Amino acid sequence: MTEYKLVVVGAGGVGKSALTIQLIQNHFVDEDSYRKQVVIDGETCLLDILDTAGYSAMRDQYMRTGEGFLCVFAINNTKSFEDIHHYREQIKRVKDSEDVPMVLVGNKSDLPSRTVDTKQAQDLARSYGIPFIETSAKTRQRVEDAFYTLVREIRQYRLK
Numbered sequence: 001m002t003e004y005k006l007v008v009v010g011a012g013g014v015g016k017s018a019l020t021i022q023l024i025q026n027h028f029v030d031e032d033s034y035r036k037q038v039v040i041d042g043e044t045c046l047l048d049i050l051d052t053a054g055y056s057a058m059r060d061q062y063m064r065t066g067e068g069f070l071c072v073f074a075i076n077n078t079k080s081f082e083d084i085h086h087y088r089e090q091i092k093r094v095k096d097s098e099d100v101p102m103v104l105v106g107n108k109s110d111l112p113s114r115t116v117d118t119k120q121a122q123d124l125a126r127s128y129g130i131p132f133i134e135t136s137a138k139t140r141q142r143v144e145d146a147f148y149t150l151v152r153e154i155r156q157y158r159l160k
């Protein structure tokens, strides 16, 4: 049975841990790695998800092992959005490729204290050649979509 190593990265407090727990428990949280078997497009797989912190050698190891990365920012935190550059650069450096499966996730979509426009994040994701999904760990909106889209990007990459 195919296994996918997924890595959830992003600045402190964007909701990396909250998104992972929503996928795993279907509950909003008020452990560093999780397993979950799912069917996508008629194919069973085991998701092996790493919840990271917002050490340069351990960092390099998960960026090497990871097959797909959820690059998470919070819509109410512009620094966390600007920081996506840094996570992407680090991953591309370690993987020696401009082509790494990634999805840009704008979390906390439920919040009215919004400082990052959907259009801004859409255009950046277009520049990176990656999908963009807005999610809410609080309400579970698009959380499965974010992780499943990332699995579909890994499968698309595996064709190339």
Ligand SMILES: NCCN[C@H]1CC[C@@H](Nc2ncc3cc2C(=O)N([C@H]2CC[C@@H](N)CC2)CCCCCN2C(NS3(=O)=O)[S+]3C4=C(Cl)CC=C(O)C423)CC1
Pocket: 005, 006, 007, 031, 032, 033, 034, 048, 049, 050, 051, 052, 053, 058, 059, 061, 062, 063, 065, 066, 067
């Ligand atoms: N969010 C809390 C912070 N947690 C981070 C998690 C990331 C860092 N820890 C690790 N980073 C990488 C590795 C092991 C550990 C590492 O040493 N840990 C331990 C896990 C036990 C304790 N909670 C302390 C930290 C994190 C869990 C590693 C899980 C195995 N693993 C991997 N192992 S590893 O490459 O040897 S790598 C990986 C990917 Cl990519 C995808 C799915 C996986 O399961 C993966 C720093 C601490």
Ligand SMILES: Nc1nc2c(ncn2[C@@H]2O[C@H](COP(=O)(O)OP(=O)(O)NP(=O)(O)O)[C@@H](O)[C@H]2O)c(=O)[nH]1
Pocket: 010, 011, 012, 013, 014, 015, 016, 017, 018, 019, 029, 030, 052, 053, 054, 107, 108, 109, 110, 111, 135, 136, 137, 138, 139
């Ligand atoms: N309103 C709202 N708050 C959320 C959302 N996701 C997470 N939070 C809140 O944001 C804070 C940090 O969430 P957490 O999941 O710990 O973020 P993290 O990125 O894992 N943090 P760290 O990098 O420190 O490990 C918590 O108060 C959590 O409840 C969301 O979609 N909406």
Ligand SMILES: [Co+2]
Pocket: 085, 086, 089
């Ligand atoms: Co740079």
Ligand SMILES: [Mg+2]
Pocket: 016, 017, 018, 051, 052
């Ligand atoms: Mg966390």
